[PDB]
Design a protein around this ligand. Structure first.
Ligand SMILES: COc1ccc(NC(=S)NCCCn2ccnc2)cc1OC
Ligand SMILES: [Cl-]
Ligand SMILES: [Zn+2]
Length: 326
């Protein structure tokens, strides 16, 4: 019955003083300089930047005190440009814990031939989501380090996934997109979890996949996409509302709130799809509408909004602590 524990799992909700501490514990300027700026480079698969992006994400995780276990899931696949190597980065606390909350984004940038003297760096898409995950790891390090301590009083921890090869090379289709995610979901589906078990796979182990994409533009609006994760999306609305009311958000009004009551009339393709189709519950933190700059050379650092990202960092960090009971 352990694979059903996720259906009954409740948050341990932070009080006001805890919320203030979380809000004070994250640094948007430190993220900007140390986590975000190095990723703002061309990083399509096999490019020098793909290698540098990968190294940057690993080193940043390595310096932290929490007991993160890193693994590079490297594979080859045919593409419209010929065979390419892809590498998902998986960073895991407590890898033998039966359950994990999983946060994810893609670290590859879409390939574009250079227009004027300009290159596409996918600032919202998804360098900012990567940086937010790294800042989350750093900001919560002391709290996460406590998961190293084994206790009677759930068998639940945290995993981060930075997918390679989310983007189409040429034209989005089932076969030219989601190379990293289709590979990893397939592997996890085939892999026993916990080790030695019968029946259960690493996908049963995924409580919830929180997939960040297209984050960093001002005034984003996120639909509540899926009934099976609606209660968790509702927690994000309430965290946002509470942080607002306590004066812990910046340049944020109730009218301009991010997390919306409405859903979306269509299906958005992204890295969650190969997990969702195999039954994993997904919280897809991608906005509708997409950033105005989407898939334009304008998806760049100048067009990011610092306050928005700092606000969303606070809300995500609170969510994660509440989910993990920390
Ligand atoms: C410009 O607005 C949109 C364009 C297309 C879609 N539909 C789909 S299926 N998009 C999949 C995007 C995959 N991806 C994510 C990041 N980089 C690429 C929805 C849009 O606004 C709701
Ligand atoms: Cl739209
Ligand atoms: Zn994209």
């Amino acid at each position: 019955a352990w694979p059903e524990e996720k259906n009954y799992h409740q948050p341990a909700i932070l009080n006001s003083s805890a919320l203030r501490q979380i809000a004070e514990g994250t640094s948007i300027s430190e993220m900007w300089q140390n986590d975000l700026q190095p990723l703002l480079i061309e990083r399509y698969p096999g490019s020098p930047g793909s290698y540098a992006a990968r190294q940057h994400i690993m080193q940043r995780i390595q310096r932290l005190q929490a007991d993160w276990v890193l693994e590079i899931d490297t594979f080859l696949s045919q593409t419209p440009e010929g065979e390419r190597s892809f590498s998902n980065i998986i960073s895991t606390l407590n890898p033998t814990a039966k359950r994990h909350l999983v946060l994810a984004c893609h670290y590859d940038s879409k390939y574009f031939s250079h227009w004027n003297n300009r290159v596409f760096v996918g600032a919202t898409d998804s360098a900012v989501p990567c940086a937010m995950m790294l800042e989350l790891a750093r900001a919560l390090d002391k709290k996460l380090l406590s998961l190293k301590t084994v206790s009677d009083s759930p068998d639940l921890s945290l995993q981060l996934i930075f997918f390679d090869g989310e983007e189409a090379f040429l034209h989005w289709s089932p076969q030219d997109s989601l190379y990293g995610s289709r590979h990893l979901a397939a592997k996890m589906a085939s892999t026993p979890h916990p080790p030695g078990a019968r029946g259960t796979s690493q996908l049963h182990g995924m409580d919830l996949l929180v997939l960040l994409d297209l984050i960093g533009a001002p005034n984003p609006t996120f639909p509540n996409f899926f009934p099976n994760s609606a209660r968790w999306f509702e927690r994000l609305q309430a965290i946002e509302h509470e942080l607002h009311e306590l004066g812990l958000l910046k340049d944020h009004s109730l009218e301009g709130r991010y997390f919306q009551n409405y859903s979306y009339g269509g299906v958005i393709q992204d890295d969650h799809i190969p997990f969702l189709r195999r039954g994993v519950p997904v919280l897809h933190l991608i906005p509708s509408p997409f950033p105005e700059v989407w898939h334009t050379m304008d998806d760049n650092e100048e067009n990011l909004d610092e306050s928005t990202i700092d606000n969303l960092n606070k809300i995500l960090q609170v969510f994660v602590l509440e989910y993990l009971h920390l």
